[PDB]
């Protein structure tokens, strides 16, 4: 069965993804919960908008929750008459239908990879989470005589698998590291800003790689017309038109994606603010820092291990920069809020009839939230300052650092350039919210004029590895730093 | 006064226990609080069952708590007519009376050890928590001419004290490490299971060591009839009858012990679930792992130091095994629960009349508990994987590891064999609850057929150390690994 | 402009303080918030005492908070008739007026230091938090030809700046380390007690350094009459009279300072007890431990770095001393409180009409506080004991240790002598509350008889550094230990 594949790229990608997902049942269950998350968000928002009445809920015999819920018939009648809501529900239904169809198609293709694991590799589905990827790669390459997946090429090699899995991630790394994509901007009051989100990356990959109109013919060969310099201008113009149309589509879909992002951000993070608002101050490796610190021919887990080992030194380093004004404001606000809250709590404990006064419960809640938020900006008063060994420890893991960082380890310029690789979580969320608004502006006005230069890149930096196909040229662009893959 | 003892075993055990309890007043106070804990549990459960009425409490002018409490006379009348409760109270009273009498007898014997510390050793009761056991041992052995506790033997030795204190723990170690006790079982759906609890250990020590019918004549000499192989079968049969009778007694007492265990588990752990349910996921060294990693002639603190030093590497190692399905379920349940709880909290903050709706407070409480529980199964997303150095660091402390562990440090078999030495806290509680049910079945059906082999052990592995008595043979059974006492 | 200063001591102190405060705007904002803190405390306490009525608040249609607030006119009438409150308000107003006038005067003098930073040093106010003090010192000393601040002395030196900033802190260090100040006391039931607070230090510096009647003539020269031994007795008598008058003034002001301290302690710490009572068990370097471990000619940040680096080993060391009785009491109290609270929480969750019973909410709150407090005295059950390497690591940072500490690292005497350098936070607060009561007794009865010896000190241990002035003799008093500045 594993002879007529013709899509070894997708086959190896699935073989890797099924091992990274810890088997088949876990993958199926994750996909099911993703679908259920979307359905639950949509249904819960619609129910909140239509069914509940909020009149007999806000009290304007004890009243139950089911009284505030309208019966099914009148709620359906109120739903089917909104007009501006059924037109959103239709689109959110067709999108979910497309997603469910894609999931149904993916299950029938992942069952075959499950069978390929069970029989061809002799690896049970209960030994996957205990087999490193090197062992699975060795079992793939050494048994390539039985399943005979690739006979055209004389043999199979680990480098062949690395090229098959990472044919487009190498192109993305080379495009980001040669400053061929518009992800640096100058803003008044902020300065340099790196705006790279998931929407922008998805749009770049849709414009350049996927679709029947992209630069790559089938899966592993860019169209031969893109290997001839005699028509640079015409190809650049066609790519510009494609980018313009995709940007127009994004601008049209902007409000739906914005509503979805707002709803998801609320349903996902509006409780962490209440309970533990310090979790949104912890930093994470930005999406640009994942493409800047990535080697060529490096799988996702190989990069994630390095980004994990260098996470605590990076947090320590970014904590070595005291923000004085923020700490002053936090200290004083915490003092005032706690001084009012102590009086409120004492009056509540003495005689509890105070809990019946109107705005006492809300005041206690909001003052507790204020104290908890303010006490999260105050660093540990006894912390050491070693901002020079920390960069050495970090560079020993991430392997990449601009050359003007080793000496001046404590300046204000090094921090403002490391913060683009190691960004806040709140900034991540905030620029995830603004992505559906800014992405069309970036695609229409900023990426479109570069459509010529890109055409040159794919023409000058695409090699032909025998048996694999058209791959990206390796680290000849010595704009980055030390390697050690 | 310290010449006519005749029970040097118990004397040295008390001298060690008074130092391990940080003096005399702390020991007295701990015993008093244990008695008060038992009395409080029983009295509080009886009061909850009988006095309170729960009719005018559940509301079916503001009502006070003392209204729900029945007056003393009617509560006593309701207690003395239950029949199925006074028969439990009588037994719980005679058991507590026996415990209190034992405590009263132990105080009059520990005051003498206090005097022995003050005068014979010249160690004030305020310098005990600052004197290591080596110093107390040296002061015992070097001043053995004044108090002349042991004149029969020519001198006193540290090894003599070690043998006197640990005469039965060595026997327990040798019995557990030679697989002479039934504590490994095969279960459908679980596989290998090590069931070793405090009830089983207490029953083993009662069957073999304590009592006027055990194998040991007075304190330090097993009956001479157990040193002759001419009557192996008769002694095995007598031991089998003894085990059967003790198992029958345990089976009869099963319901009382089960009720006590349920009540104690509720009163002790039902609040940690509410506030911090992650404390019951932290692991601890099981009761079998304390007898498997124990050297011969090793006091309790000498073993506890090693089990403390190797606690954080063991936690790190057991955390290096990601449970994928549990993490998926936890993530999704936390998302859903928090998404509902955020809406509830926002509606509560906006207008607080919502707090009067019937099932809003209970819903908020249960959803908070659900979020807090689910957020305790999600590991740190940035954690390193070094499961090979961790076993080296652990073995450098616990000194014992099966030989097929060093190489294959990340397999599923090594984890399932280390988890029997380092078990969950929730599993500890759960198998503490099932102990009064399973212990009689283990004693009647599993330990009884081995009654012959044990008789051989005590006959072939009991040496006679001069001046000390009948002790267990040392580590000639090379079934374990590296030592270094 | 920077030629006619004549007060280089204050100028260099301000230049250092503006850099330690992270610029000018942060300093201004901190001073403003200090003034606002005082004003807020006074106004809030007066409002609580007078305006609110607590009759219609304790409930003896839903009642609002503004109903309990009396209208402005009747509240002003109730304020202006208290008599025993307006006499406190007048004093708290004149003190705040003096503070505000001092702040207004300090701003007009710190703007000049801001200009001196901007122009003379060419350091923008946005590069201060990224310039170590060594760089600012180098820019001060190397550009001393342009601003020509000090021409009398041939040149300027880093040692000159060190002497100018720390002319009185060296005197305080030498006075504390020669046992010339009464800060050790013998108390029945406690033993040795080191009572050194901020009030005592302020009074010492006011008696000896500041004021027109102190020992120092203008700023940098003690009166020549204090360099002649022909009048030791008369000068000692005059100093004794001065100390007596200052102590009488403190005894008169005692009630106001005591009221202020009580109010500030409540408004600042009465919420940390509720939420996280374990933060008041964490230790901090006492005010005596900051003067005992301080080198000569050592700025505040140079000492704070050492006190920061040696904070975690010191906490570990002070945690290695188990308090047995406290742990027993904490365990048992936590058990009882949690056992009652679990029943209350279960009854609350089952049927919520129980929340309307009178003393259920207060009971739940107080039992939660009790459980949270008791669970803060229980140490980690798996902790290592290495109390000998910890003293080495600590001494490698604090540089000072009595000689009888290295060997006997675990005795009860070493802990009771380290706890005076590393005290609790609760003890700090408690002896901050008792300071206005004990300070006059210490100044009148204990410091006054020493008034002769001090007069000898300033006469025998004051050298004349050329260009700087009268400074304190360096570490010739070899009563302390290893240095390495
Ligand atoms: C686009 C599709 C929209 C779907 C909308 C639903 C999405 C839901 C998803 C999620 C909402 C989660 C809460 C659901 C409410 C459950 C409450 C409950 O127990 O049952 C409720 C019981 O209701 P009842 O008592 O029969 O009604 C009382 C009416 N009465 C006052 C006249 C008697
Ligand atoms: C013109 C042609 C093409 C123009 C279409 C441009 C769409 C741009 C979407 C940008 C975007 O946010 O994509 C993001 C998600 O988005 C998706 O996964 C698909 C979004 C499709 C939105 C269409 C709504 C229904 C249209 C109905 C019209 C009637 C990309 O995020 P990601 O993580 O890269 O994607 C992984 C998907 N996952 C997160 C669900 C696993
Ligand atoms: C409500 C706030 C919810 C979001 C909380 C996190 C926002 C955030 O990124 O905070 C960050 C910045 O924060 C800033 O730079 C400005 C602070 C938040 C702006 C809003 C002010 C309050 C409204 C946190 O600032 P930080 O000093 O890095 O705090 C971490 C320092 N620590 C890890 C030592 C504790
Ligand atoms: O920027 C500054 C701080 O700026 C902040 O830290 C802003 C933080 C406040 C935003 C909080 C949003 C909370 C969204 C959730 C609320 C719940 C959802 C509510 C939904 C309704 C600098 O931050 P940085 O990380 O140094 O800069 C990195 C950015 N860069 C890479 C572009 C340089
Ligand atoms: C086996 C032995 C059984 C012992 C059972 C006791 C175990 C207790 C151990 C523990 C229970 C802990 C709670 C005890 C209740 C105390 C409440 C309180 O303050 O006093 C209570 C006051 O009661 P009262 O107001 O006099 O009664 C009101 C009756 N009336 C409504 C008619 C007026
Ligand atoms: C036939 C002859 C003997 C048969 C008796 C067999 C009893 C088996 C008990 C098993 C058990 O759980 O023991 C456990 C406790 O238990 C005890 O401490 C004593 C329990 C006695 C229960 C009798 C109830 C009253 C009987 C009235 C009849 C009328 C052992 O636990 P442990 O920690 O080893 O013990 C330390 C005790 N401590 C925890 C209190 C410090
Ligand atoms: O087993 C698996 C997990 O299994 C679990 O972890 C089960 C945990 C759920 C039990 C929770 C009980 C809470 C009791 C308190 C509630 C409050 C009291 C309520 C009282 C009414 C494996 O776990 P392990 O540790 O790898 O296996 C060790 C077991 N062995 C040594 C036999 C191999
Ligand atoms: C020494 C100087 C003393 C200064 C004292 C003040 C210090 C304050 C500092 C701090 C107190 C902080 C709380 C202030 C109260 C604010 C409440 C609010 O919103 O306004 C309040 C609104 O009040 P109102 O509704 O106009 O009054 C209702 C009266 N009525 C019932 C007759 C209608
Ligand atoms: C006779 C002559 C002098 C006798 C006066 C002796 C005063 C002793 C005060 C002791 C004291 O607690 O001082 C403390 C504070 O205190 C101050 O800052 C000033 C206190 C003045 C109190 C006068 C009240 C109004 C008198 C009105 C009469 C009509 C010292 O604390 P500190 O931290 O060293 O000071 C820094 C100030 N800071 C904390 C605000 C930054
Ligand atoms: C209410 C209490 C509020 C203050 C809490 C802190 C008081 C305090 O200094 O506790 C301290 C002592 O504490 C003692 O030495 C006695 C304990 C407090 C005395 C009052 C008893 C309860 C009333 C804490 O005692 P500890 O054992 O150092 O606790 C820290 C040990 N740990 C860091 C390992 C957890
Ligand atoms: O002493 C012993 C413990 O003693 C304690 O630890 C006492 C702690 C309880 C005091 C809590 C006060 C809380 C004040 C806030 C409440 C809110 C405000 C409420 C305001 C109304 C020993 O402690 P130590 O640290 O080893 O001894 C150092 C002291 N020495 C240097 C003198 C030796």
PDB file of N, CA and C in Angstrom, chain C residues 369-398:
ATOM      1  N   UNK C 369      -9.002  32.190  57.680  1.00  0.00           N
ATOM      2  CA  UNK C 369      -7.824  32.919  58.145  1.00  0.00           C
ATOM      3  C   UNK C 369      -6.990  32.048  59.076  1.00  0.00           C
ATOM      4  N   UNK C 370      -7.648  31.293  59.958  1.00  0.00           N
ATOM      5  CA  UNK C 370      -6.925  30.436  60.892  1.00  0.00           C
ATOM      6  C   UNK C 370      -6.165  29.338  60.157  1.00  0.00           C
ATOM      7  N   UNK C 371      -6.813  28.693  59.186  1.00  0.00           N
ATOM      8  CA  UNK C 371      -6.141  27.650  58.413  1.00  0.00           C
ATOM      9  C   UNK C 371      -4.960  28.231  57.650  1.00  0.00           C
ATOM     10  N   UNK C 372      -5.151  29.394  57.021  1.00  0.00           N
ATOM     11  CA  UNK C 372      -4.081  29.989  56.228  1.00  0.00           C
ATOM     12  C   UNK C 372      -2.908  30.406  57.105  1.00  0.00           C
ATOM     13  N   UNK C 373      -3.186  30.893  58.315  1.00  0.00           N
ATOM     14  CA  UNK C 373      -2.112  31.286  59.220  1.00  0.00           C
ATOM     15  C   UNK C 373      -1.373  30.057  59.734  1.00  0.00           C
ATOM     16  N   UNK C 374      -2.118  29.022  60.131  1.00  0.00           N
ATOM     17  CA  UNK C 374      -1.490  27.831  60.690  1.00  0.00           C
ATOM     18  C   UNK C 374      -0.677  27.073  59.649  1.00  0.00           C
ATOM     19  N   UNK C 375      -1.120  27.063  58.393  1.00  0.00           N
ATOM     20  CA  UNK C 375      -0.383  26.388  57.334  1.00  0.00           C
ATOM     21  C   UNK C 375       0.854  27.156  56.889  1.00  0.00           C
ATOM     22  N   UNK C 376       1.181  28.266  57.547  1.00  0.00           N
ATOM     23  CA  UNK C 376       2.373  29.037  57.227  1.00  0.00           C
ATOM     24  C   UNK C 376       3.516  28.786  58.198  1.00  0.00           C
ATOM     25  N   UNK C 377       3.272  28.067  59.290  1.00  0.00           N
ATOM     26  CA  UNK C 377       4.314  27.700  60.237  1.00  0.00           C
ATOM     27  C   UNK C 377       4.841  26.290  60.009  1.00  0.00           C
ATOM     28  N   UNK C 378       4.260  25.547  59.075  1.00  0.00           N
ATOM     29  CA  UNK C 378       4.659  24.168  58.804  1.00  0.00           C
ATOM     30  C   UNK C 378       5.712  24.192  57.699  1.00  0.00           C
ATOM     31  N   UNK C 379       6.954  23.807  57.976  1.00  0.00           N
ATOM     32  CA  UNK C 379       7.990  23.826  56.941  1.00  0.00           C
ATOM     33  C   UNK C 379       7.778  22.710  55.926  1.00  0.00           C
ATOM     34  N   UNK C 380       8.586  22.754  54.870  1.00  0.00           N
ATOM     35  CA  UNK C 380       8.577  21.687  53.879  1.00  0.00           C
ATOM     36  C   UNK C 380       9.117  20.402  54.495  1.00  0.00           C
ATOM     37  N   UNK C 381       8.317  19.337  54.430  1.00  0.00           N
ATOM     38  CA  UNK C 381       8.667  18.104  55.128  1.00  0.00           C
ATOM     39  C   UNK C 381       9.911  17.452  54.542  1.00  0.00           C
ATOM     40  N   UNK C 382      10.246  17.766  53.294  1.00  0.00           N
ATOM     41  CA  UNK C 382      11.439  17.236  52.640  1.00  0.00           C
ATOM     42  C   UNK C 382      12.385  18.402  52.365  1.00  0.00           C
ATOM     43  N   UNK C 383      13.208  18.727  53.360  1.00  0.00           N
ATOM     44  CA  UNK C 383      14.219  19.766  53.231  1.00  0.00           C
ATOM     45  C   UNK C 383      15.543  19.245  53.769  1.00  0.00           C
ATOM     46  N   UNK C 384      16.635  19.673  53.144  1.00  0.00           N
ATOM     47  CA  UNK C 384      17.960  19.185  53.492  1.00  0.00           C
ATOM     48  C   UNK C 384      18.534  20.033  54.619  1.00  0.00           C
ATOM     49  N   UNK C 385      19.535  19.483  55.303  1.00  0.00           N
ATOM     50  CA  UNK C 385      20.187  20.138  56.436  1.00  0.00           C
ATOM     51  C   UNK C 385      21.679  20.245  56.140  1.00  0.00           C
ATOM     52  N   UNK C 386      22.115  21.421  55.697  1.00  0.00           N
ATOM     53  CA  UNK C 386      23.531  21.707  55.462  1.00  0.00           C
ATOM     54  C   UNK C 386      23.907  23.026  56.128  1.00  0.00           C
ATOM     55  N   UNK C 387      23.857  23.088  57.463  1.00  0.00           N
ATOM     56  CA  UNK C 387      24.083  24.367  58.148  1.00  0.00           C
ATOM     57  C   UNK C 387      25.542  24.764  58.272  1.00  0.00           C
ATOM     58  N   UNK C 388      26.458  24.070  57.600  1.00  0.00           N
ATOM     59  CA  UNK C 388      27.868  24.434  57.657  1.00  0.00           C
ATOM     60  C   UNK C 388      28.349  25.102  56.379  1.00  0.00           C
ATOM     61  N   UNK C 389      27.906  24.620  55.217  1.00  0.00           N
ATOM     62  CA  UNK C 389      28.229  25.304  53.971  1.00  0.00           C
ATOM     63  C   UNK C 389      27.472  26.619  53.856  1.00  0.00           C
ATOM     64  N   UNK C 390      26.306  26.711  54.496  1.00  0.00           N
ATOM     65  CA  UNK C 390      25.514  27.930  54.419  1.00  0.00           C
ATOM     66  C   UNK C 390      26.222  29.104  55.079  1.00  0.00           C
ATOM     67  N   UNK C 391      26.880  28.886  56.219  1.00  0.00           N
ATOM     68  CA  UNK C 391      27.618  29.985  56.832  1.00  0.00           C
ATOM     69  C   UNK C 391      28.794  30.415  55.967  1.00  0.00           C
ATOM     70  N   UNK C 392      29.442  29.471  55.283  1.00  0.00           N
ATOM     71  CA  UNK C 392      30.515  29.845  54.368  1.00  0.00           C
ATOM     72  C   UNK C 392      29.984  30.712  53.234  1.00  0.00           C
ATOM     73  N   UNK C 393      28.859  30.308  52.640  1.00  0.00           N
ATOM     74  CA  UNK C 393      28.282  31.084  51.543  1.00  0.00           C
ATOM     75  C   UNK C 393      27.849  32.464  52.025  1.00  0.00           C
ATOM     76  N   UNK C 394      27.318  32.549  53.246  1.00  0.00           N
ATOM     77  CA  UNK C 394      26.869  33.837  53.771  1.00  0.00           C
ATOM     78  C   UNK C 394      28.060  34.744  54.049  1.00  0.00           C
ATOM     79  N   UNK C 395      29.067  34.224  54.757  1.00  0.00           N
ATOM     80  CA  UNK C 395      30.264  35.002  55.056  1.00  0.00           C
ATOM     81  C   UNK C 395      30.975  35.448  53.786  1.00  0.00           C
ATOM     82  N   UNK C 396      30.876  34.664  52.710  1.00  0.00           N
ATOM     83  CA  UNK C 396      31.446  35.090  51.439  1.00  0.00           C
ATOM     84  C   UNK C 396      30.770  36.333  50.875  1.00  0.00           C
ATOM     85  N   UNK C 397      29.639  36.754  51.439  1.00  0.00           N
ATOM     86  CA  UNK C 397      28.925  37.943  50.989  1.00  0.00           C
ATOM     87  C   UNK C 397      28.923  39.059  52.023  1.00  0.00           C
ATOM     88  N   UNK C 398      28.520  38.766  53.264  1.00  0.00           N
ATOM     89  CA  UNK C 398      28.424  39.813  54.281  1.00  0.00           C
ATOM     90  C   UNK C 398      29.769  40.179  54.888  1.00  0.00           C
TER      91      UNK C 398
END
